[PDB]
Write a protein that binds this ligand. Structure first.
Ligand SMILES: *[C@@H]1O[C@H](CO)[C@@H](O[C@@H]2O[C@H](CO)[C@@H](O[C@@H]3O[C@H](CO[C@H]4O[C@H](CO[C@H]5O[C@H](CO)[C@@H](O)[C@H](O)[C@@H]5O)[C@@H](O)[C@H](O[C@H]5O[C@H](CO)[C@@H](O)[C@H](O)[C@@H]5O)[C@@H]4O)[C@@H](O)[C@H](O[C@H]4O[C@H](CO)[C@@H](O)[C@H](O)[C@@H]4O)[C@@H]3O)[C@H](O)[C@H]2NC(C)=O)[C@H](O)[C@H]1NC(C)=O
Ligand SMILES: *[C@@H]1O[C@H](CO)[C@@H](O[C@@H]2O[C@H](CO)[C@@H](O[C@@H]3O[C@H](CO[C@H]4O[C@H](CO)[C@@H](O)[C@H](O)[C@@H]4O)[C@@H](O)[C@H](O[C@H]4O[C@H](CO)[C@@H](O)[C@H](O)[C@@H]4O)[C@@H]3O)[C@H](O)[C@H]2NC(C)=O)[C@H](O)[C@H]1NC(C)=O
Ligand code: HEM
Ligand code: 3DM
Ligand code: 3DM
Ligand code: 3DM
Ligand code: MG
Length: 335
């Protein structure tokens, strides 16, 4: 048995600001079995009941929740969600854990596929995050107070005590440098190289209240509330427009950087990878991930094959727009 996965939701009918921390979506504490992970956006949505409070959801539920709760732009939602689902979800049950492994995603897929959730390191989740530490140090998912203290420090140093685009530029680079110096397994290429820039502007574009139209900047109180406690600020109103990675280009421009990693299990040994995706070679990310999916699913048949074909297509519909045109790949043929 299994599920027939629907195509992704489109943009919301209403795209203006609104109160999202409302009576129908109260913060609630974790219960036993509830899953949380490396994403403060999804974490907050689950802890306010925009997602199932147990942190396991369908792609469709994730897309709608990111739109409803934060006005995450539809294409960005599709690109992120099916990326996470293809690599880390259960394609038969159509369920993805926003954190680690759980029976709630249903019967496990055939290895080497895992449905292990967004916590799985090395193809999606990766190094030099803002409030999470690299997997090498033992925990890639929990809030890390030391890293948050650095976030605060950089906000004091470059943003007048607030997180803004200038802070994002400085913090992104400094976090790269931390990982070069301390993590001999540090990788910063392919998916991670791309996602690591967008992630640093989401707090500006999506965590700042939507009633703020000029000089958008995030207070440390609001940052702590979301990044640490998975709680919307009091009276939080979402972005007044669909938004995602606006300004990520400026973050890169502040400290130009090339995909790569520390070679040969050694610190301070960063080598460029000329084959990696980058921001002028985005379709390589698409091809790379399709390749990764084939490694996870070398010979699917039946429902699994069907659901793979559909999810791959759904992802491509977003990638095609977001990346400015990529030739669709059909590793398992057609339906
Ligand atoms: C994230 O948050 C941060 C923090 O809030 C935020 O930072 C602000 O960013 C803006 C711009 O990005 C800053 O405003 C600019 O400041 C520039 C630097 O100014 C210095 O130099 C000025 C020029 O000096 C001349 O004259 C002196 C003699 O006095 C001489 O030695 C020099 O050689 C030179 O010839 C000087 O005017 C200025 O001093 C003034 O302001 C300070 C207060 O900061 C005051 O104490 C002084 O008495 C004096 O009034 C300072 O020393 C400046 O160049 C720049 O100017 C341009 O823009 C203005 C306005 O648009 C025009 O009027 C002007 O003609 C220029 O074209 C501008 O004012 C601001 O200071 C930052 N604030 C802080 C606290 O750091 C980031 O922007 C945020 N990021 C995002 C993306 O939002
Ligand atoms: C929350 O997140 C932080 C940050 O990721 C974690 O703290 C880091 O923990 C790691 C592992 O203990 C530390 O790594 C070691 O750092 C040494 C360098 O430290 C100095 O230099 C850096 C800047 O270059 C400063 O930030 C720091 O304060 C020090 O002044 C390295 O020399 C070590 O290398 C040795 O081990 C590696 C791995 O085996 C080898 O490859 C090397 O060859 C060598 O033998 C090592 O990498 C790191 O410094 C910590 N950072 C900070 C600033 O604390 C927290 O543990 C994590 N946990 C919490 C708080 O919940
Ligand atoms: C749409 C589906 C989403 C998926 C699948 C997703 C997935 C992820 C993953 C896997 C990470 C960890 C990245 C890493 O370690 O390399 C992450 C980080 C992050 N996500 Fe999400 N995310 C989604 C939506 C959102 C939304 C809507 C927001 C903001 C409103 C958001 C904000 C963030 C931020 C700020 C981080 C960085 C956390 C840190 O470094 O401290 N995400 N996300
Ligand atoms: C990781 O996803 C993306 C990377 C770069 C650009 C995007 O949309 C404009 C985008 O959605
Ligand atoms: C659309 O782009 C993204 C969505 C969710 C998380 C991301 O980086 C961690 C990211 O870059
Ligand atoms: C709606 O169109 C499709 C649905 C599922 C799979 C497809 O091609 C792989 C496809 O083209
Ligand atoms: Mg990470």
């Amino acid at each position: 048995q299994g599920v027939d996965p629907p195509p992704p939701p489109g943009p919301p009918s209403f795209t203006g600001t609104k109160l999202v921390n409302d009576a129908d979506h109260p913060w609630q504490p974790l219960r036993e079995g509830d899953i949380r992970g490396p994403c403060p956006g999804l974490n907050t949505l689950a802890s306010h009941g925009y997602l199932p409070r147990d942190g396991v959801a369908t792609p469709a539920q994730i897309i709608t929740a990111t739109q409803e709760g934060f006005n995450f732009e539809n294409n960005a939602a599709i690109v992120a969600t099916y990326l996470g689902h293809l690599l880390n979800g259960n394609l038969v049950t159509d369920l993805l854990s926003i954190g680690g492994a759980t029976p709630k995603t249903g019967p496990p897929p055939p290895p080497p596929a895992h449905a292990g959730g967004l916590n799985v390191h090395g193809t999606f989740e990766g190094d030099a995050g803002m409030t999470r530490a690299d997997e090498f140090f033992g925990d890639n998912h929990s809030f890390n107070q030391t890293l948050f203290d650095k976030f605060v420090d950089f906000s004091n140093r470059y943003g007048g005590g607030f997180y803004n685009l200038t802070v994002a530029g400085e913090l992104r680079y400094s976090r790269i440098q931390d990982s070069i110096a301390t993590n001999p397994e540090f990788q910063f290429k392919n998916v991670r190289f791309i996602t690591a820039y967008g992630e640093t502007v989401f707090p500006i574009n999506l965590f700042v209240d939507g009633r703020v139209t000029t000089d958008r900047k995030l207070s440390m109180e609001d940052a702590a509330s979301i990044f640490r406690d998975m709680r919307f600020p009091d009276d939080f109103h979402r972005s007044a427009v669909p938004a995602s990675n606006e300004g990520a280009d400026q973050v890169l421009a502040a400290h130009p950087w090339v995909p790569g990693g520390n070679a040969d299990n050694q610190v301070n040994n960063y080598v460029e990878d000329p084959d990696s995706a980058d921001f002028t070679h985005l379709c390589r990310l698409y091809e790379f991930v399709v390749g990764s999916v084939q490694e996870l699913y070398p010979n699917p048949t039946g429902i699994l094959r069907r659901n793979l074909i559909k999810n791959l297509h759904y992802w491509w519909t977003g990638v095609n727009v977001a990346f400015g045109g990529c030739d669709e790949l059909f590793p398992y043929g057609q339906l």
